[PDB]
Symmetry: C5
């Protein structure tokens, strides 16, 4: 029984994030539990303050006509249990629920460990004979407690795009709003646990420049290369199949090279020291000692700049 | 109370994919959330526009007779919540729901990382005394937003086979339609993370052709063969027990050989250098240096062609 | 309100497998989506064809008395949504649902990768004052499309045991039927990915018979033994804790031995070549070169026969 | 509307395990699907056999007063769907459901792989004005088919403690019963797959007593120690964070030592063979050859006894 | 229909933890199953003991007005099934449910393995026209059986903050209480399985001070550094991305250094023993033998103190 209007009836939305959790980098989803605040004039149940009852009148959902606010990017039906409904006398309805859905928003691992993100919640609303425009009431959208969690992420700001998007979808205009959650990652644990460890093994790799034993230079560079895959794999796991390149996928892959040419050198400093020409051997070996760290540190500046500095 | 007809009553279907996600290569399933649009003439509730009410009349599902449209390939009952029902005066009924099921469609990993796929959604409909033919209404089948996701897959086209398939099933004809989702994979992350790494280790393997130390030739070829299993295993994991052969299962397996005859060579260049005949040793070793990469690159041309080029 | 009979009322069952999927070797369960066809004479709603209505009369589930057909081996309540109900005039009722349950049937990994299986679905039915015998109507049991999936399994036949099993269970006889799904595995992917790889490493292991370097004979046999665990572990994972012995658990375990006595030999061809008695060393080493492959190939014939040939 | 009594009304319980599965060693839970049989005299619906109807009268749950039997140790609300309700004329009610809950019972990994366990199901019942004692009716508790599964566990006996426990809980006595499921593990797969493999690597470790090459004695003892962690880690995984000590956590940890003093010896048999005193070297090395296996086999007798023999 | 009051109606709460389980260090959540006890004077259904019925009168939830007690930090709607409702004659209502929700409380891994924690449960309550203050009734808050589980955690105390927090939230004051669960970890399994094993490998690392073979000093220090990553990784896994530093993240990271300067030394005791100056070599090497263990044991006193002793 939709409220007999004279024009597109506007419905007034808001979202108070009570809880944030389970942001899943692989699945590109997160889980939110929040308030959903709605309101609209249904003059059709305006009601004589003095003549009866009190200031505001409470209803159950079945009584009143309520607009179907479906979320757009959601695994399943959003799990909202209802909070209160209060009709003003001007037939203005005050609705409040408290849902929990898991939300499908995409992420940009281009700067993987040092990445900031922007999440989205949607809310469409399909029309019947009266159109529905949705729109944001900002006193009920300050939604986000002084408690919101989201492990391993610093939470920057919860806002929304005042102007809705009115589509036509199947001979019935719908109206969709954009609620925005901005977060930066707490890169850090990414250092003592990945970044540094990964580097260390790489240095020991090329300990093999100040050595001459092949057996202990392969027992050297090879043994560490194994370890690097242990990281490449550790990392590749908590991360989806990007069709593009990650920052650390980059340096992690750039690394694979420095092990190759490293192994190349130790290898040459052999078919070039068994050929009686150690003139050249401890010439090259002596050189690599510099080339390598420089080319590297150079490539990181080159690489790093390429990603953040552009 | 099914609508009294004169012939097989046609029901008119459509599907607007709102969401695609969780394509599971191992399980050969995916998850879709979409609109389901139905329609049919139930002259039995035609209704005098002028004489009463308005243009189109809204019903709840319990009122009208609605045809049971079950999906054919689905884990469980399809999770449809209903959107709107609108009856035309000519007794023409307009139905819309918005379901989410997980769908069991098979995949062909014959060209694994470089494979394109074709998914299916079905919709049978069993008859009573009047027969039901289903059929596609293509204005409601353009279904697939400008947003459809499906991580790590490029989505090519969502169409449907206009002609239904009318079975006899248990002394009651059913009618089944075929909705078709065509996708190609985003092979790519499969390169810096699998394809290349896998190759690199293989090359270092046969660094041991320009070497003479057995200890460092086993510390060599053996240490890398281990790593190859690390990949063979990484890959075998995100992939089901194909009764046929994958492309990368192929090359991954072809590889195992090049490590064998590699180890064979290093082994021979020993019971053939301890037998005082290094005439032959650094003859063979000198040879392998060429045989190997060639036979390989040859075998990949041979292999590759065999899969894609046919 | 159960149908007033003169003897045990027979209910007539059938199952049309629409979908098969998610066979879980570890959990020993699978998931089926199929038709469930029932029928019985409830003379109590026989109905004068001419005198009223038509040939067959349609009912909703609440109207008629329907027999409770519970499945015996199921995680949870079977998820059946209903298809059609049609009463013949002789008071003969025609019932059809389309359930999806996950089914707990056990498997015999005695021939693991080369194993055929036999799955079960049950259907008991508890009596009240009239007994219920169930029984199979074979036109509705040809159930199994020309499409049934079940990844990595060849599907052999879907039949059923005509004679039911009438128990006494708690002062009320129940009646249980046995629907039988026979499948053989698509062993194959088990070869390029497990069987062969596993063998190769074993051969390279004993490359160390044509070698004399201990360092490269341990860097040899040891480095490969690691790899074998990689497989032993890979395999032990997609497989439950059998109280009995698997075929490949067998050969996988028989293998562990050939690495031991292998390492034993390399070890002895050392405290027996450092003891100045290489008379014996390259006598043993020379021997092992034959003993090993033979004892093995012998043990596999012995082993293989023991499992399949008996 | 609870049955007007003269004393604490006794309710008579029973449980027929139809299915057992998903015992989770880490989570210390399992999943059961079983019958729940209840009964009590509600004289309030006694009913004149002759004067009307028949022997026993069937009700739906809404009609009769039924006692709330909540299970005590359960993740969520127990998922019971109802089977039959039959009232005797003496107003004696016969209730049957068939629930499936996942149950939280603790385990004692003190003898980990060789451990027998005892599981628990509870059933409290809170009173109103008449008290409720629960109690067991043992013809309906023989519950446990000739089919109950529970992978990798031998099932010993399903009994129950006849005497309930009547608490006071919040100014209302509740009554709790204890249903007991006793199981021993199928240790076995724990041998070819953990126990033996683990030992083997340990022996090869100390192959390095009959050797003199440091490079091949570290390439020896070190290479195997790695493998041991591979097991320590494999094992630690399928097992929770015991605040106490496991049996295999013990021997697995005792092992770590024999690798240490092993490495110690090889290390000493070096700064004691580079110090020109091989008088002592192949004296110690010669000794270790015995000390080690003995101390070990001794420590296992010591250890093993400590756990099982006490 | 809320109870007509003269002032802010106080609602009286309590929680009897029946079950604790699934505390998830990564996710920072846990799962509780407990009683929720409420009460308030609704003089509006006070009721003449003598004049009718009995001492206390039982209602179903639909009859009475009940206050919406939502939990503040919860993944989803709290899964409460209801226990009993009893109205006193003074119109005092006695409510009891038994919910199970999973609860989102944060943890402080600053002293990781040796960390005590404090969990929280909340309960807000939004007002209408009469305000609601919540408050704690301590006879129903002794909640926590003599059975509460929580694997790998010693449970210290379940209390609550008597004074509620009355917010203004969206032109309606809500009232929130704080239920407090204090737990310390059962660090211990953290020793035979992490702490010790991790130390051992570190000592063997620097076995390479009493050695001179580079090949066996890299086959030494390098082979163990690999193992250390095996732990660094094992540990980093059961632990979230702390924006701060863990205690063991500390020592685990401090360790990485002692392997570096260790490898540095072995490396120098080479380009300083190939330079004919073993004057210095077995001077340094002789020194490290002390420096290392001391600096370490010193740094742990330094480190340890820094964390616990402050
Ligand atoms: Zn259109
Ligand atoms: Zn060596
Ligand atoms: Zn009283």
């Amino acid at each position: 029984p939709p409220p007999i209007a004279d024009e597109p009836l506007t419905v007034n939305t808001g979202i108070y994030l009570i809880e944030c959790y389970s942001l899943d980098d692989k699945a590109e989803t997160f889980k939110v539990n929040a308030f959903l605040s709605l309101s609209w004039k249904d003059r059709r149940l305006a009601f004589d303050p003095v003549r009866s009852g009190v200031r505001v009148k409470t209803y159950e959902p079945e009584a009143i006509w309520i607009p179907e606010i479906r979320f757009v990017n959601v695994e399943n039906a959003r799990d909202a249990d209802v909070v209160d409904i209060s009709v003003s006398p001007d037939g203005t309805v005050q609705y409040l629920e408290r849902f929990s859905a898991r939300v499908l928003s995409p992420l940009d691992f281009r700067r993987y460990p040092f990445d900031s993100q922007t999440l989205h919640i949607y809310l469409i609303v399909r029309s019947v004979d009266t159109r529905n425009i949705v729109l944001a009431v900002d006193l009920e959208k300050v939604g986000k407690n002084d408690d919101v969690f989201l492990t391993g992420w610093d939470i920057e700001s919860f806002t929304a795009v005042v102007k809705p998007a009115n589509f036509a979808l199947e001979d019935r205009l719908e109206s969709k709003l954009d609620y925005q959650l901005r977060i930066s990652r707490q890169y850090f644990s990414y250092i003592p646990n990945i970044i540094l460890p990964m580097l260390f093994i790489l240095f020991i790799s090329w300990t093999a420049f100040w050595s001459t034993s092949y057996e202990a230079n392969v027992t050297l560079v090879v043994s560490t290369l194994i370890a690097h895959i242990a990281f490449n794999i550790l990392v590749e796991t908590n991360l989806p199949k990007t069709p593009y390149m990650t920052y650390t996928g980059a340096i992690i892959f750039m690394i694979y090279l420095f092990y190759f040419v490293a192994v190349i050198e130790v290898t040459v400093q052999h078919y070039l020291k068994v050929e009686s020409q150690p003139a050249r051997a401890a010439s090259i070996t002596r050189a690599s000692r510099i080339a390598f760290p420089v080319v590297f540190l150079l490539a990181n500046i080159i690489l790093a700049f390429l990603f953040f500095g552009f």
